[PDB]
Amino acid sequence: IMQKSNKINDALNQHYKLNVELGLVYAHYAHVADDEFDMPYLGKFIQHLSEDKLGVHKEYISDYFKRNGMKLKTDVSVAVKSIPSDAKALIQEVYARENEVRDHVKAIAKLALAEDDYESFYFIQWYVRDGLKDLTEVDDVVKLFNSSNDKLIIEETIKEMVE
Amino acid sequence: IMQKSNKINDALNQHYKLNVELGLVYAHYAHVADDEFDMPYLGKFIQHLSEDKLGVHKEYISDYFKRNGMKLKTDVSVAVKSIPSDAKALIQEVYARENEVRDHVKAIAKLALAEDDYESFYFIQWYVRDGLKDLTEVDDVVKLFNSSNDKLIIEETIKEMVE
Amino acid sequence: IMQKSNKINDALNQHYKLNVELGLVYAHYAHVADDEFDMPYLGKFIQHLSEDKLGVHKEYISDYFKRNGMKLKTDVSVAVKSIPSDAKALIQEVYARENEVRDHVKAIAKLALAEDDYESFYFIQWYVRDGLKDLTEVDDVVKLFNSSNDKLIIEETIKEMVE
Amino acid sequence: IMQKSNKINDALNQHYKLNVELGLVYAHYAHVADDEFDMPYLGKFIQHLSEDKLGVHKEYISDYFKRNGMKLKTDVSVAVKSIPSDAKALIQEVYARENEVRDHVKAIAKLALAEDDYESFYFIQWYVRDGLKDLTEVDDVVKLFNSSNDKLIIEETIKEMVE
Amino acid sequence: IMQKSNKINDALNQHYKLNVELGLVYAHYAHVADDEFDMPYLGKFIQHLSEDKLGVHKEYISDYFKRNGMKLKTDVSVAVKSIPSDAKALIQEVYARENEVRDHVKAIAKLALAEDDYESFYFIQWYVRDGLKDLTEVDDVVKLFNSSNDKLIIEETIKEMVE
Amino acid sequence: IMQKSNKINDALNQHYKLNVELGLVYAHYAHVADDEFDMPYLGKFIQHLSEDKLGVHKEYISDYFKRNGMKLKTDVSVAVKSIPSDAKALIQEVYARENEVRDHVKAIAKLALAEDDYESFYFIQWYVRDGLKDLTEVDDVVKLFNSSNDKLIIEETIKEMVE
Ligand SMILES: [Cl-]
Ligand SMILES: [Cl-]
Ligand SMILES: [Cl-]
Ligand SMILES: [Cl-]
Ligand SMILES: [Cl-]
Ligand SMILES: [Cl-]
Ligand SMILES: [Cl-]
Ligand SMILES: [Cl-]
Ligand SMILES: [Cl-]
Ligand SMILES: [Cl-]
Ligand SMILES: [Cl-]
Ligand SMILES: [Cl-]
Ligand SMILES: [Cl-]
Ligand SMILES: [Cl-]
Ligand SMILES: [Cl-]
Ligand SMILES: [Cl-]
Ligand SMILES: [Cl-]
Ligand SMILES: [Cl-]
Ligand SMILES: [Fe+3]
Ligand SMILES: [Fe+3]
Ligand SMILES: [Fe+3]
Ligand SMILES: [Fe+3]
Ligand SMILES: [Fe+3]
Ligand SMILES: [Fe+3]
Ligand SMILES: [Fe+3]
Ligand SMILES: [Fe+3]
Ligand SMILES: [Fe+3]
Ligand SMILES: [Fe+3]
Ligand SMILES: [Fe+3]
Ligand SMILES: [Fe+3]
Ligand SMILES: [Fe+3]
Ligand SMILES: [Fe+3]
Ligand SMILES: [Fe+3]
Ligand SMILES: [Fe+3]
Ligand SMILES: [Fe+3]
Ligand SMILES: [Fe+3]
Ligand SMILES: [Fe+3]
Ligand SMILES: [Fe+3]
Ligand SMILES: [Fe+3]
Ligand SMILES: [Fe+3]
Ligand SMILES: [Fe+3]
Ligand SMILES: [Fe+3]
Ligand SMILES: [Fe+3]
Ligand SMILES: [Fe+3]
Ligand SMILES: [Fe+3]
Ligand SMILES: [Fe+3]
Ligand SMILES: [Fe+3]
Ligand SMILES: [Fe+3]
Ligand SMILES: [Fe+3]
Ligand SMILES: [Fe+3]
Ligand SMILES: [Fe+3]
Ligand SMILES: [Fe+3]
Ligand SMILES: [Fe+3]
Ligand SMILES: [Fe+3]
Ligand SMILES: [Mg+2]
Ligand SMILES: [Mg+2]
Ligand SMILES: [Mg+2]
Ligand SMILES: [Mg+2]
Ligand SMILES: [Mg+2]
Ligand SMILES: [Mg+2]
Numbered sequence: 001i002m003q004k005s006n007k008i009n010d011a012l013n014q015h016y017k018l019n020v021e022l023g024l025v026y027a028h029y030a031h032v033a034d035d036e037f038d039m040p041y042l043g044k045f046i047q048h049l050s051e052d053k054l055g056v057h058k059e060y061i062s063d064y065f066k067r068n069g070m071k072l073k074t075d076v077s078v079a080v081k082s083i084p085s086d087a088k089a090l091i092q093e094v095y096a097r098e099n100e101v102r103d104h105v106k107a108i109a110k111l112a113l114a115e116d117d118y119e120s121f122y123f124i125q126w127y128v129r130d131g132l133k134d135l136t137e138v139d140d141v142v143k144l145f146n147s148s149n150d151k152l153i154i155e156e157t158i159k160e161m162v163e
Numbered sequence: 164i165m166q167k168s169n170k171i172n173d174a175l176n177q178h179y180k181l182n183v184e185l186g187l188v189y190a191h192y193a194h195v196a197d198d199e200f201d202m203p204y205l206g207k208f209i210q211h212l213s214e215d216k217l218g219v220h221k222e223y224i225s226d227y228f229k230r231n232g233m234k235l236k237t238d239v240s241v242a243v244k245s246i247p248s249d250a251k252a253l254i255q256e257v258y259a260r261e262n263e264v265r266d267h268v269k270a271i272a273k274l275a276l277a278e279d280d281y282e283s284f285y286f287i288q289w290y291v292r293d294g295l296k297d298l299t300e301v302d303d304v305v306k307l308f309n310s311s312n313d314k315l316i317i318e319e320t321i322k323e324m325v326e
Numbered sequence: 327i328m329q330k331s332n333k334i335n336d337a338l339n340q341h342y343k344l345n346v347e348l349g350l351v352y353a354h355y356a357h358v359a360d361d362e363f364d365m366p367y368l369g370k371f372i373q374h375l376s377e378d379k380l381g382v383h384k385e386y387i388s389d390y391f392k393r394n395g396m397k398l399k400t401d402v403s404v405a406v407k408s409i410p411s412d413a414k415a416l417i418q419e420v421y422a423r424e425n426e427v428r429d430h431v432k433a434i435a436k437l438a439l440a441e442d443d444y445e446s447f448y449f450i451q452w453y454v455r456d457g458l459k460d461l462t463e464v465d466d467v468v469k470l471f472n473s474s475n476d477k478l479i480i481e482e483t484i485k486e487m488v489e
Numbered sequence: 490i491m492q493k494s495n496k497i498n499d500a501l502n503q504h505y506k507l508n509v510e511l512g513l514v515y516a517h518y519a520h521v522a523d524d525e526f527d528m529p530y531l532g533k534f535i536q537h538l539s540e541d542k543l544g545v546h547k548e549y550i551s552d553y554f555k556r557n558g559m560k561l562k563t564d565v566s567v568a569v570k571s572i573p574s575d576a577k578a579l580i581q582e583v584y585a586r587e588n589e590v591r592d593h594v595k596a597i598a599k600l601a602l603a604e605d606d607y608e609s610f611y612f613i614q615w616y617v618r619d620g621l622k623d624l625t626e627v628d629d630v631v632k633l634f635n636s637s638n639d640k641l642i643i644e645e646t647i648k649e650m651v652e
Numbered sequence: 653i654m655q656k657s658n659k660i661n662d663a664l665n666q667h668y669k670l671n672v673e674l675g676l677v678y679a680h681y682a683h684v685a686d687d688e689f690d691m692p693y694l695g696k697f698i699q700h701l702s703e704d705k706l707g708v709h710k711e712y713i714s715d716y717f718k719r720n721g722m723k724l725k726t727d728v729s730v731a732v733k734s735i736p737s738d739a740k741a742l743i744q745e746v747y748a749r750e751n752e753v754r755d756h757v758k759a760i761a762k763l764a765l766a767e768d769d770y771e772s773f774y775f776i777q778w779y780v781r782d783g784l785k786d787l788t789e790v791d792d793v794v795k796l797f798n799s800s801n802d803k804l805i806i807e808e809t810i811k812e813m814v815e
Numbered sequence: 816i817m818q819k820s821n822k823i824n825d826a827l828n829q830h831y832k833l834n835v836e837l838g839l840v841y842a843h844y845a846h847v848a849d850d851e852f853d854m855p856y857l858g859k860f861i862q863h864l865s866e867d868k869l870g871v872h873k874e875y876i877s878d879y880f881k882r883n884g885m886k887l888k889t890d891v892s893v894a895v896k897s898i899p900s901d902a903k904a905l906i907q908e909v910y911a912r913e914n915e916v917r918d919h920v921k922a923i924a925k926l927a928l929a930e931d932d933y934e935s936f937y938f939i940q941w942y943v944r945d946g947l948k949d950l951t952e953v954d955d956v957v958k959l960f961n962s963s964n965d966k967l968i969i970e971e972t973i974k975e976m977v978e
Binding site for chain 2: 020021024025027028031032034035054058062065066072073074075076077078079080
């Protein structure tokens with residue numbers, strides 16, 4: 001009784017992998033935003049997202065598995081082989097990835113209900129809302145680039161968001 | 164003038180890769196120590212080392228590169244395909260890896276002097292001592308396992324080290 | 327991907343409309359409770375519900391739409407053409423309306439699951455419980471009128487609820 | 490003796506209606522300013538005006554009527570069927586409406602004197618000055634749009650006004 | 653409209669009964685752990701679980717029923733006719749019972765969705781997570797017995813959990 | 816020497832049973848007082864008595880047995896199959912039960928002296944006085960119902976007793 005769902009186990013290991021590799025790409029993007037595009041505050045915004053993906057986003061799954069018998073799998077593979085050409089494109093790529101995270105999370109909630117796994121429906125509840133919150137935070141930045149053509153104006157505006 | 168050394172650049176990208184992948188293995192080892200071997204405090208010790216490897220150990224290189232023109236490379240590949248059979252072997256494997264870190268750091272200091280790159284000799288100075296400090300911290304744990312045959316005694320002793 | 331559900335959009339615009347118009351009726355009922363029925367504390371209870379319906383009940387939908395791409399619609403039409411004959415009937419009408427709110431909210435949760443829109447299932451989670459809470463608060467008042475035949479006793483009891 | 494003026498009663502019910510419907514349009518305009526025009530601070534300025542129109546602007550009339558025997562009428566009808574094409578036009582429309590409020594208030598003061606209703610001349614005294622104050626606050630914003638062509642500069646300036 | 657589900661009513665009365673009778677068994681187990689097995693801290697851990705089952709676990713259902721019209725039923729029958737032979741078996745029996753609680757709670761969430769009773773799906777949300785939390789707390793104790801063969805070591809470790 | 820009296824053991828297990836089952840009936844009565852009879856403060860008075868019967872009233876016996884070698888017996892059987900018709904009758908039934916508690920306690924003191932069990936005469940000393948105190952507290956409530964015919968007056972008076 002209460003035997004863990006292998007489908008849910010797989011999908012949460014997949015999501016664990018996604019957050020690790022995303023966090024590694026964002027750590028690189030954070031470096032580029034500062035060093036190449038001369039936007040250190042944009043860099044700290046993306047670093048904070050990097051530490052988020054590699055922090056609680058992965059630890060919550062780790063900690064959930066210890067409580068329910070699911071097995072953790074560490075299989076990580078990510079290479080940053082090209083970088084967007086400028087800062088706007090850099091944040092827009094981050095947006096496109098965060099929008100995909102929402103879709104992965106939605107598949108997990110759907111599957112949890114399909115598996116009658118209400119503990120896992122509950123756990124994913126945090127990820128459902130962080131999907132929209134993280135995406136909204138990124139969107140608030142993508143936008144600055146369509147409201148000003150001045151890197152330093154945009155930077156001053158980001159400073160009050162990464163406070 | 165002051166053109167960055169490509170050899171040093173390569174070796175620090177290699178060390179960046181090492182700290183990322185180590186930190187990912189330790190995050191998995193931390194989970195196993197708690198869930199499988201019933202040692203949550205041993206798990207928090209190894210988690211703290213995981214967050215260390217994936218935190219300042221990699222960020223210092225990232226931040227150094229922004230200051231000197233070296234290029235950051237994100238090429239990460241690590242899979243945890245087997246786990247040591249028990250807690251002692253788990254910490255002993257961590258030890259063997261930390262001992263290899265000391266040797267990688269030593270090659271970098273040697274090369275920095277060979278390149279007349281005293282900024283990089285200086286930067287590695289932090290890593291020279293953290294090599295011995297992290298290894299000594301791990302050693303203090305490996306030992307508990309040869310001083311007591313009681314998991315709970317060992318655990319109570321680790322609690323006062325990960326405070 | 328992640329395209330907003332038009333059905334959910336419509337139903338939340340409908341619920342937005344419901345909360346605005348309810349809040350306008352309650353503002354009028356609050357005035358009547360004080361001026362005509364000589365019950366100022368009953369009036370402050372109903373005013374607080376009015377400011378609730380016209381405050382967070384509508385703003386949460388507004389703010390949700392900005393985050394997910396749904397479109398806000400402002401189409402408001404309400405006239406208070408008759409008033410209940412006394413204070414008991416006044417609060418009983420408020421009750422009947424709050425009981426209908428629970429049913430509207432329930433249709434939205436049902437539809438969110440039917441649309442596989444777990445972000446919207448989550449958002450409505452707040453409204454599911456406020457449906458019962460607001461209805462329970464109103465019920466605690468409707469009752470005073472069956473426990474005492476003294477307007478001033480009832481009023482003294484409401485004072486400790488709208489504190 | 491001291492029988493309430495029906496003309497004043499009608500005109501204050503009309504002004505009550507005006508403030509409700511204005512506040513509903515401004516709540517929608519506040520949403521648009523943030524979501525569509527990417528100006529969240531402009532949105533908070535207009536939200537504050539919305540809560541003003543729907544708050545004390547209407548409650549003062551409600552409370553006045555309880556004291557003098559005038560009858561409250563709730564007859565509300567407003568639909569937002571088109572939106573100004575950009576942020577400047579959005580605030581300019583708000584201005585045009587606030588300028589009309591001054592004229593409605595002026596008719597009420599004129600009528601109060603014509604009715605020898607000095608209690609109502611006094612009550613409207615608050616609205617006479619808030620007509621100019623609210624209009625001046627809106628004007629301070631309309632202007633930013635003629636002093637800078639940078640959305641983010643304008644936004645940073647509004648932030649210090651909606652504090 | 654909004655008529656309470658009799659199926660949900662029955663299942664929550666059943667769960668009410670389960671928590672009462674569990675709490676009575678645990679109160680007895682707490683006594684035995686201290687008096688017979690000489691483990692007073694193990695006793696305080698099990699007493700805390702007893703007061704939990706007989707406290708909020710039952711009161712939340714009681715309070716929920718007052719709000720939605722469901723009827724409370726008090727039909728209680730439990731006799732402790734044998735006790736596990738030692739402390740390990742005692743906590744393992746507690747574990748087996750807590751694991752069954754998770755399954756009862758899961759049937760209630762399933763039924764709430766099947767009944768389109770989202771207020772009851774929401775209410776059970778608390779029980780879904782306390783099912784795993786209480787079971788995890790008990791598991792943390794069952795384990796001590798496989799990590800040390802010393803009653804007093806185990807006891808010293810429990811003291812820091814029932815703090 | 817100092818061998819525990821089996822008669823006293825039996826009578827205190829009987830009293831343990833009485834306090835458990837009373838506390839379960841009072842928990843149900845507390846719910847009814849609030850939900851059906853619209854008297855939430857009367858409900859909190861009876862809940863406090865419920866938590867008393869199920870708290871120290873039973874734990875003192877449990878703790879006494881650990882100290883003297885008497886054996887705890889958990890044999891519980893109570894069903895609430897009918898409820899008094901109104902609030903007065905509800906509190907009067909509670910009174911009749913508390914009056915029986917005094918008589919059970921008196922038999923235990925008598926028996927303790929007859930057994931020359933002065934430790935048990937001493938322990939029951941607490942129950943002798945709580946018999947009169949709890950009964951006096953209940954009596955102070957039964958009375959309100961003969962001094963006012965207004966549910967809300969009675970409720971306001973209970974509020975200052977369950978503080
Ligand atoms: Cl590659
Ligand atoms: Cl996208
Ligand atoms: Cl699915
Ligand atoms: Cl592989
Ligand atoms: Cl080694
Ligand atoms: Cl070298
Ligand atoms: Cl009409
Ligand atoms: Cl109804
Ligand atoms: Cl539906
Ligand atoms: Cl229209
Ligand atoms: Cl104008
Ligand atoms: Cl005039
Ligand atoms: Cl039996
Ligand atoms: Cl089990
Ligand atoms: Cl079902
Ligand atoms: Cl029966
Ligand atoms: Cl009696
Ligand atoms: Cl006797
Ligand atoms: Fe760079
Ligand atoms: Fe910098
Ligand atoms: Fe954040
Ligand atoms: Fe570009
Ligand atoms: Fe996040
Ligand atoms: Fe500033
Ligand atoms: Fe595991
Ligand atoms: Fe743990
Ligand atoms: Fe450290
Ligand atoms: Fe070994
Ligand atoms: Fe380190
Ligand atoms: Fe210590
Ligand atoms: Fe009136
Ligand atoms: Fe007043
Ligand atoms: Fe409230
Ligand atoms: Fe009537
Ligand atoms: Fe509400
Ligand atoms: Fe009072
Ligand atoms: Fe919009
Ligand atoms: Fe925003
Ligand atoms: Fe203002
Ligand atoms: Fe224009
Ligand atoms: Fe104003
Ligand atoms: Fe400033
Ligand atoms: Fe015993
Ligand atoms: Fe003791
Ligand atoms: Fe607890
Ligand atoms: Fe055994
Ligand atoms: Fe619990
Ligand atoms: Fe200690
Ligand atoms: Fe009831
Ligand atoms: Fe209540
Ligand atoms: Fe008391
Ligand atoms: Fe009667
Ligand atoms: Fe008592
Ligand atoms: Fe008082
Ligand atoms: Mg199904
Ligand atoms: Mg040389
Ligand atoms: Mg489906
Ligand atoms: Mg004249
Ligand atoms: Mg269905
Ligand atoms: Mg004698």
